[PDB]
XYZ file of C-alpha atoms in Angstrom:
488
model
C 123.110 117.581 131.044
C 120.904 118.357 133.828
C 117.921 120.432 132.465
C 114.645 121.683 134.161
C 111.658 119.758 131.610
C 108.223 120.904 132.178
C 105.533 119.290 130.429
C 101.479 120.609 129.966
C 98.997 118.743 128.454
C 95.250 118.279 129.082
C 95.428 114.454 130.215
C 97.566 112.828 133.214
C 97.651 109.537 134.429
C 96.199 108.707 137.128
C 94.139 111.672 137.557
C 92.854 111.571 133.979
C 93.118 109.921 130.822
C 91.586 108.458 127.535
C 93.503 107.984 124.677
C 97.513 107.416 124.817
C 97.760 111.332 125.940
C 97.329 110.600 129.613
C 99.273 107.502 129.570
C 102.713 109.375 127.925
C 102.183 112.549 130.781
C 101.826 109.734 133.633
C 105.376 107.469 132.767
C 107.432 109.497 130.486
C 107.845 112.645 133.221
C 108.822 110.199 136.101
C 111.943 108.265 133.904
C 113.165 111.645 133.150
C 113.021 112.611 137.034
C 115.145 109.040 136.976
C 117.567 111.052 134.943
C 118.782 113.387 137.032
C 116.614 116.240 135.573
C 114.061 118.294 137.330
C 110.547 117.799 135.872
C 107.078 119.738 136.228
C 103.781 118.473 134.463
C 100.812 120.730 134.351
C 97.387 119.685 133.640
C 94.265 120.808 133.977
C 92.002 120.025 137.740
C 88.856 118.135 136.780
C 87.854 116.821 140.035
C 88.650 117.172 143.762
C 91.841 114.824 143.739
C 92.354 113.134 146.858
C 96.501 113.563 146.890
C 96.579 117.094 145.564
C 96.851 119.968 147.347
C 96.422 123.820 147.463
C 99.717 125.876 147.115
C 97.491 128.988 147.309
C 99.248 130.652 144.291
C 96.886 132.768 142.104
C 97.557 134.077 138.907
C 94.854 135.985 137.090
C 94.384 135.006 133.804
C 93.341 137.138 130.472
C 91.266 135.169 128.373
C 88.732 136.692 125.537
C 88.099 140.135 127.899
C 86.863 137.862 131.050
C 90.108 138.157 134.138
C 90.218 134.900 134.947
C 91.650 133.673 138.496
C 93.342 130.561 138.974
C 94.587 128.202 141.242
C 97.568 126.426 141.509
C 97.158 122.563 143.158
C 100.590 120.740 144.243
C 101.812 116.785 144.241
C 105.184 115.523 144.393
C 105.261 112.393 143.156
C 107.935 110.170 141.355
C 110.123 112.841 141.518
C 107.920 115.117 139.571
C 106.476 118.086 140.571
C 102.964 117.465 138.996
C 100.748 120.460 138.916
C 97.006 120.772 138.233
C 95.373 123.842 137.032
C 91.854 124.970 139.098
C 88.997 127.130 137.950
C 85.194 126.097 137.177
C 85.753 126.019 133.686
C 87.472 122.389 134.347
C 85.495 121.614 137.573
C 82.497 121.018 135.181
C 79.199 118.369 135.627
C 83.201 126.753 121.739
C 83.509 126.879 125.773
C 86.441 124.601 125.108
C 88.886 127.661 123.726
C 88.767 129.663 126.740
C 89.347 126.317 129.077
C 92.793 125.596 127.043
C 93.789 129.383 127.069
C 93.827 128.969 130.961
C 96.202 125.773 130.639
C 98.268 127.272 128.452
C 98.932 130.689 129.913
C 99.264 129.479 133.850
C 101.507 126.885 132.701
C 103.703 129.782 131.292
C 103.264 131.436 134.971
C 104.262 128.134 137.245
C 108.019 127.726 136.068
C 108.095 131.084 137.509
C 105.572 131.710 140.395
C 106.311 128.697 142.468
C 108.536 127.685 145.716
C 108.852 123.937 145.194
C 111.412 122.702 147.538
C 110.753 119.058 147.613
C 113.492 118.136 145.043
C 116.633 116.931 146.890
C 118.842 118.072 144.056
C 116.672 121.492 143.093
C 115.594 124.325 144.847
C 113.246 127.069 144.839
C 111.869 128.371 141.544
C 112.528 126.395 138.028
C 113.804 129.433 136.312
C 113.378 130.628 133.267
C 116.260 128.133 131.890
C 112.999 125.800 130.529
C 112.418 123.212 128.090
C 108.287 122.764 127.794
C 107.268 119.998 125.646
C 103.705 120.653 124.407
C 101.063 117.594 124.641
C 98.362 117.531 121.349
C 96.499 120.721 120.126
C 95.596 121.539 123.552
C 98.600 123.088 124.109
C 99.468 124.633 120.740
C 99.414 128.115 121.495
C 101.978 127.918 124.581
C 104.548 128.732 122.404
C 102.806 131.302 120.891
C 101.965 133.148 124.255
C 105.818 132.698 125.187
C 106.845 134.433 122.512
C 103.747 137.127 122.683
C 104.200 138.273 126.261
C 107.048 137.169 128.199
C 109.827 137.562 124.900
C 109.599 140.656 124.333
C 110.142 141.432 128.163
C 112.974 139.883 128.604
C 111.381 136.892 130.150
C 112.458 133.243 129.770
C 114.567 134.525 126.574
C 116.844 131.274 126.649
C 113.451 128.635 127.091
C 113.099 126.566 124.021
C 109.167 124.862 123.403
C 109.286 120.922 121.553
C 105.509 120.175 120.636
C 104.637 116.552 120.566
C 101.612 114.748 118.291
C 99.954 111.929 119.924
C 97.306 112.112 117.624
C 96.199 114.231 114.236
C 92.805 113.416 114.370
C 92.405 116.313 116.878
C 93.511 119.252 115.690
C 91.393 122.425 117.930
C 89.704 123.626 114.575
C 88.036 126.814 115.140
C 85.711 129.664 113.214
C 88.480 131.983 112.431
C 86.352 134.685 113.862
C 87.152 133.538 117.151
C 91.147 134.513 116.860
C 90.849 137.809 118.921
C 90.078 135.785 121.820
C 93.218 134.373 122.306
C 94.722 137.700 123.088
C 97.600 137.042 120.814
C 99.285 139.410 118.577
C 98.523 139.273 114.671
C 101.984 138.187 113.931
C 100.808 134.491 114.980
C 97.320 134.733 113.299
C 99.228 133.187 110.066
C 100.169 129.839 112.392
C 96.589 129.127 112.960
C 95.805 129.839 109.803
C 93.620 127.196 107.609
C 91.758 125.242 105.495
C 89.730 122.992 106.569
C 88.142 120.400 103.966
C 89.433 122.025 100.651
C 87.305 121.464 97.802
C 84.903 119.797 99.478
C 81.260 121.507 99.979
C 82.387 122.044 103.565
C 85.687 124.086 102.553
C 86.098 126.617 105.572
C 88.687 129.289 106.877
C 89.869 127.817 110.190
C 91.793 128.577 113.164
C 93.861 125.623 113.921
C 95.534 125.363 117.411
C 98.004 121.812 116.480
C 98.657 124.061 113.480
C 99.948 126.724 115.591
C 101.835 124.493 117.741
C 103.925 122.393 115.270
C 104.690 126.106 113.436
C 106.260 127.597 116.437
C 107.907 125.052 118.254
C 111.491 124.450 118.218
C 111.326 121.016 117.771
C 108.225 118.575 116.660
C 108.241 114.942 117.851
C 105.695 112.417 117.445
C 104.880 108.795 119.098
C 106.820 107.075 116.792
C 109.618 106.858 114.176
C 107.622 104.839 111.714
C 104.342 107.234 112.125
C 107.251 110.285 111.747
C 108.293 108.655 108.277
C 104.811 108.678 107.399
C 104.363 112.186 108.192
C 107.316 113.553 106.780
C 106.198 111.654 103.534
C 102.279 112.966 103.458
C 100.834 109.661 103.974
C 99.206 112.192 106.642
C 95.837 111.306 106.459
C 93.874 112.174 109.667
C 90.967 110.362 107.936
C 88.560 113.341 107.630
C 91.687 115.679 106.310
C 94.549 115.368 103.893
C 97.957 116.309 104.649
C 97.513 118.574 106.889
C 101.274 120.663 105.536
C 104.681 119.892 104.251
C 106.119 118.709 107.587
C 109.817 118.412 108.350
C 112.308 117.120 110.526
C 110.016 115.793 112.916
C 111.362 113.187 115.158
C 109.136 110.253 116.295
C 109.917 107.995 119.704
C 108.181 104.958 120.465
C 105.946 105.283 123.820
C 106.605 103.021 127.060
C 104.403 101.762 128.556
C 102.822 102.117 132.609
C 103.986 98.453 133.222
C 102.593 98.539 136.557
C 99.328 99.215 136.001
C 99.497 96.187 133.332
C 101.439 93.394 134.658
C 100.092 90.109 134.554
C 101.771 88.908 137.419
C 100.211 91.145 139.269
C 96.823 91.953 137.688
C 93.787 91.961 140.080
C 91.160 91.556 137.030
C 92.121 87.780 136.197
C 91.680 84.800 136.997
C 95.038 83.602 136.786
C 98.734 85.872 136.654
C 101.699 84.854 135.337
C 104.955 85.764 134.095
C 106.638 84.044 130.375
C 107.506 80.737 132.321
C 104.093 79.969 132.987
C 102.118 82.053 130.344
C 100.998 78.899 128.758
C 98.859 77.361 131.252
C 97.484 80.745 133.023
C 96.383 81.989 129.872
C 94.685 78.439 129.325
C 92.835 79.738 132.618
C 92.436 83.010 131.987
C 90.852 82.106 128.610
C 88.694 79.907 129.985
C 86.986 82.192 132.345
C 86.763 84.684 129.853
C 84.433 82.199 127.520
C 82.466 81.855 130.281
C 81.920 85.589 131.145
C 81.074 86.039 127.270
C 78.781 83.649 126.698
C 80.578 81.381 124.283
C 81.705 77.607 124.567
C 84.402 77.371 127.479
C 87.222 75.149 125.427
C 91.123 76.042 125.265
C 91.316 74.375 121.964
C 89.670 76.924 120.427
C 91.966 79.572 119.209
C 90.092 83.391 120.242
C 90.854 86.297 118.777
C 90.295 89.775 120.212
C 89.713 92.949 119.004
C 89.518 95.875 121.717
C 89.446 99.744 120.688
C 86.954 102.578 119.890
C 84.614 102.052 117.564
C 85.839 104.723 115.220
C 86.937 104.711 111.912
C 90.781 105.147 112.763
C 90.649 101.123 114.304
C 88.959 99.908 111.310
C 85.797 97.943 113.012
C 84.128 98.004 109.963
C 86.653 96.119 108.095
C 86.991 93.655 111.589
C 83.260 93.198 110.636
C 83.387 92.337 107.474
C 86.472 89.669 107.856
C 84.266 88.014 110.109
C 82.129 85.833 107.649
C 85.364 84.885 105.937
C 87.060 83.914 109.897
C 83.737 81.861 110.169
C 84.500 79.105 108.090
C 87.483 78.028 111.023
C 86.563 77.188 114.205
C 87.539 80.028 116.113
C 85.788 82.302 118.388
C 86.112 86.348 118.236
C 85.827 88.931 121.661
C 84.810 92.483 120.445
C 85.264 95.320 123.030
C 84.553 98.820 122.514
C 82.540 101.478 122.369
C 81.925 104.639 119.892
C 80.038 105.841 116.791
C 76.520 103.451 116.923
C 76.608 102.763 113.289
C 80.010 99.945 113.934
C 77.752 99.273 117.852
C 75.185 97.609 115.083
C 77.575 96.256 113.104
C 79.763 94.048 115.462
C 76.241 93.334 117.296
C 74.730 92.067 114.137
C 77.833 90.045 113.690
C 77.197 88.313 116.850
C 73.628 87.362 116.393
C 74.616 85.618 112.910
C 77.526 83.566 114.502
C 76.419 83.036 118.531
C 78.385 80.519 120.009
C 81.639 82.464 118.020
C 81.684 86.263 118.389
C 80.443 87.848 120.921
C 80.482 91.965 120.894
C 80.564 93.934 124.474
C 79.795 97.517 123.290
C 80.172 98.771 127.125
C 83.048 100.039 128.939
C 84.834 97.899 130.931
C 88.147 98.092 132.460
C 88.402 94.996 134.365
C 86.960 92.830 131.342
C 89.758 94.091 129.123
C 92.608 92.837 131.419
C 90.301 89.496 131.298
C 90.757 89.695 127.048
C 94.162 90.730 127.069
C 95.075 87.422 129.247
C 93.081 85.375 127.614
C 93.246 86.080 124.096
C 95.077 83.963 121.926
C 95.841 86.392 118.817
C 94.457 90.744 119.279
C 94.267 91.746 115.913
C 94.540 95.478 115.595
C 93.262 96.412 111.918
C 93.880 100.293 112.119
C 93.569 102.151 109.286
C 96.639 105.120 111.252
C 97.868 104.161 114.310
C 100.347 106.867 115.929
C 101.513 104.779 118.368
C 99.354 102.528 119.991
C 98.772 100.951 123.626
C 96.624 98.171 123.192
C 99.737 96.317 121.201
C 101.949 97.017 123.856
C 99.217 95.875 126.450
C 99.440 92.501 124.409
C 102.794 91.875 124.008
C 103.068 92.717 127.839
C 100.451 90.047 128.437
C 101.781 87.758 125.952
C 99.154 87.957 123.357
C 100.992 88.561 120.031
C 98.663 91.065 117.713
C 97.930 90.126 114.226
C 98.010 94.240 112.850
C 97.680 96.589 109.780
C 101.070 97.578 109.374
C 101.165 101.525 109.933
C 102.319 103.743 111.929
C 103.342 102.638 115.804
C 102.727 98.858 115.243
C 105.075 98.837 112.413
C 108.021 99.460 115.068
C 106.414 97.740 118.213
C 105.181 94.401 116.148
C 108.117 92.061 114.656
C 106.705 89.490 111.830
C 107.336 86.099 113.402
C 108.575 87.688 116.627
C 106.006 89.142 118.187
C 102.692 89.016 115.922
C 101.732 89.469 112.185
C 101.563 91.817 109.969
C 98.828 92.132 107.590
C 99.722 94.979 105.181
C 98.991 98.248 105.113
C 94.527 99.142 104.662
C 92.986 102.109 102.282
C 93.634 104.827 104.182
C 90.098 105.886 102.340
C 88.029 106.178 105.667
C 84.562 105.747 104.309
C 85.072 102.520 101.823
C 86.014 99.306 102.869
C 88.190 97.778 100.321
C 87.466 94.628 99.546
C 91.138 93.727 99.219
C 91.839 94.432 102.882
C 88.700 92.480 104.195
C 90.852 89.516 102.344
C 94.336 90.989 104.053
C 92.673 90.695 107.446
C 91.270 87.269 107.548
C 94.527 85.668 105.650
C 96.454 86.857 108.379
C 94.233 85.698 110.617
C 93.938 82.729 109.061
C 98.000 82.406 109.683
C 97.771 83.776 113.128
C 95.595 81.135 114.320
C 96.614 78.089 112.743
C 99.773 78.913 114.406
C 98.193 79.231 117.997
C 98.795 75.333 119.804
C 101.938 74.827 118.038
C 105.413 75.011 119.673
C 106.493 78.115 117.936
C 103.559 79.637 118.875
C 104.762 79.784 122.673
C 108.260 81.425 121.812
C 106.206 84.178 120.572
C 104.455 84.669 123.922
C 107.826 84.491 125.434
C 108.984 86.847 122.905
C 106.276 88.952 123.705
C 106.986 89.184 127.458
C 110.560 89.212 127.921
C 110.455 92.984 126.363
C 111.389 95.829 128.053
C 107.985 97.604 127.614
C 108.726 100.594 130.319
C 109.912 104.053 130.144
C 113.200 103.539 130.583
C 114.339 102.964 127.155
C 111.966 105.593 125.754
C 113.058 108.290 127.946
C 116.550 108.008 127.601
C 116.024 108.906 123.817
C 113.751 112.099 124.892
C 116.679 113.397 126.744
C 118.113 113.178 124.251
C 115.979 114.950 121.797
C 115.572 117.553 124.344
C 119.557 117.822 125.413
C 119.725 119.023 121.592
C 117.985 121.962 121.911
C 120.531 123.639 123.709
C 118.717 125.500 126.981
């Protein structure tokens, strides 16, 4: 009941993040602190972070034949010791295996190498009584080395690794020629074992480093139950895969959220903040301004829809594009925000120059403009073709913008029909078509979502929306759990 958790990943918030990876290893770590539970997170050291300091600890580090000396930076934060891994390889202005080798083997030497006295409950060194929980394929072999070099020894014999999937698109695919280099034994060659695109004209023996996490771990989680269900039952499509294997057992917990970072009442991005008593006239505001920074007519009567996320096939843009001509026959206006693969950039942008004055696409990154859409969007519609988790719903439903979505994975647990936003089915998981059948899905229920916006019922949903507990707490009482059941 009162455990030592380290975590390692290659994202943190605030020091680094881009997809849901950082935001987990910035809130998650700190509620379990809350706990009563002392908690490490390692990352990697990308830059020269302002509030993190040398510990001058060195280990030396064998990856491929090179010795490799690293550094050990400190920060105690939250009540979590958060860690950051040094050497040039990160510091930076097939490389990529020998970077990840470093995080994965120092993290194995901090729980052990480190006086970190902070902690008004823990002393000292973290032991060897350790749970790690292992963040995406970056961190895949950890378990592997564990059981490779300090096992055998006698070392952290009672430690127990969970391995967690915030996203299968990823999965550290390598030329199986490349194995040796990880210094492991050929015991664990069989975990990274694989192949990629099978009967395809691109079919290819593989190392595979998520491949060789999930086989080794104790215990495999995911980001949510729903997108756990669809694992377990080979829905499993990473879009340019199949299946990946017969998983089992894995458990899925819906994300928090950092609800300080997004809190409208708060927010230094808008024009006006708020809280669900007076969410109907700020966002009036808010939406206001944000017609005017996009070009379009500046009227509250229109209802706007928003679609924010990158322009990959996972999000579905494509089939946001071509529900547009169908949306165009309303009066409503549309806010595109994202960035990625050029081939969608040209398709949203086209979309704007044959409806100006009703869509307007803002292929750029932009922080501070998407706090301006989240606050004043009326409807976010999130047509994702997989969708582990998701943030941008919960950013929504934080800001009180109820998301009209596909219904798979995360947003089929985060987004209640009538509640908190609308469902519109679930799309072809086929990546490279665009079903006609889903263009129709997306604009019906957009066609719904819309016609509701104005009316009464519309604001209970924002209410609905806001008065959730969106934070950690929740969530990380059900990790303890998870991680209370693996005996250590």
């Amino acid at each position: 009941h009162h455990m030592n958790v380290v975590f390692v990943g290659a994202e943190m918030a605030p020091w680094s993040k881009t997809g849901g990876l950082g935001d987990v290893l910035g809130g998650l770590p700190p509620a379990m602190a809350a706990n009563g539970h002392r908690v490490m997170v390692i990352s990697p050291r990308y830059d020269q972070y302002k509030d993190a300091w040398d510990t001058s600890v060195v280990a030396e580090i064998k990856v491929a034949d090179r010795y490799e000396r690293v550094r050990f930076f400190h920060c105690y934060k939250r009540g979590v010791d958060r860690v950051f891994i040094d050497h040039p390889s990160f510091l930076e202005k097939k490389d990529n295996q020998m970077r990840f080798s470093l995080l994965c083997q120092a993290a194995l030497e901090a729980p052990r190498i480190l006086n970190l006295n902070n902690n008004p409950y823990f002393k000292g060194t973290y032991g060897e009584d350790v749970v790690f929980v292992c963040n995406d394929w970056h961190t895949g072999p950890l378990a592997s080395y564990l059981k490779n070099n300090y096992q055998p020894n006698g070392i952290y014999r009672n430690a127990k690794v969970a391995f967690c999937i915030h996203n299968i698109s990823y999965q550290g695919r390598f030329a199986f020629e490349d194995y040796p280099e990880l210094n492991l034994s050929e015991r664990f060659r069989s975990s990274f074992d694989f192949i990629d695109g099978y009967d395809t004209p691109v079919e290819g023996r593989k190392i595979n480093w998520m491949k060789a996490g999930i086989l080794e771990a104790d215990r495999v989680l995911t980001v949510s139950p729903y997108y756990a269900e669809e694992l377990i039952s080979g829905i499993a499509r990473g879009c340019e895969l199949d299946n990946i294997m017969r998983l089992t057992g894995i458990t899925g917990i819906v994300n928090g959220m950092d609800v300080s970072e997004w809190d409208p009442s708060k927010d230094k991005y808008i024009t006006a903040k708020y809280d669900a008593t007076t969410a109907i006239e700020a966002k009036a505001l808010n939406k206001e301004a944000l017609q005017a920074e996009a070009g379009l007519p500046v009227d509250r009567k229109i209802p706007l829809i928003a679609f924010i996320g990158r322009l990959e096939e996972q999000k579905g843009p494509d089939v946001m594009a071509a529900a547009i001509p169908e949306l165009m026959q309303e009066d409503v206006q549309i806010v595109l925000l994202g960035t990625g693969k050029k081939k969608f950039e040209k398709l949203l942008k086209s979309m704007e120059e044959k409806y100006p004055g009703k869509v307007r696409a803002v292929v750029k990154f932009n922080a501070p403009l998407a706090h301006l859409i989240m606050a004043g969007a009326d409807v976010l519609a999130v047509p994702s073709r997989f969708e582990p988790c998701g943030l941008i719903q919960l950013q929504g439903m934080r800001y009180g913008t109820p998301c009209a979505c596909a219904s798979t994975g995360g947003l089929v647990d985060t987004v209640i029909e009538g509640k908190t936003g609308f469902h519109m089915g679930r799309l072809s998981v086929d990546c490279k078509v665009v079903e006609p059948s889903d263009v129709k899905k997306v604009a019906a229920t957009l066609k719904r979502a819309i016609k509701v916006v104005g009316t009464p019922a519309y604001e209970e949903m924002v209410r609905n929306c806001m008065n959730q507990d969106l934070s950690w707490k929740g969530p990380a009482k059900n990790w303890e759990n998870v991680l209370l059941g693996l005996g250590v």
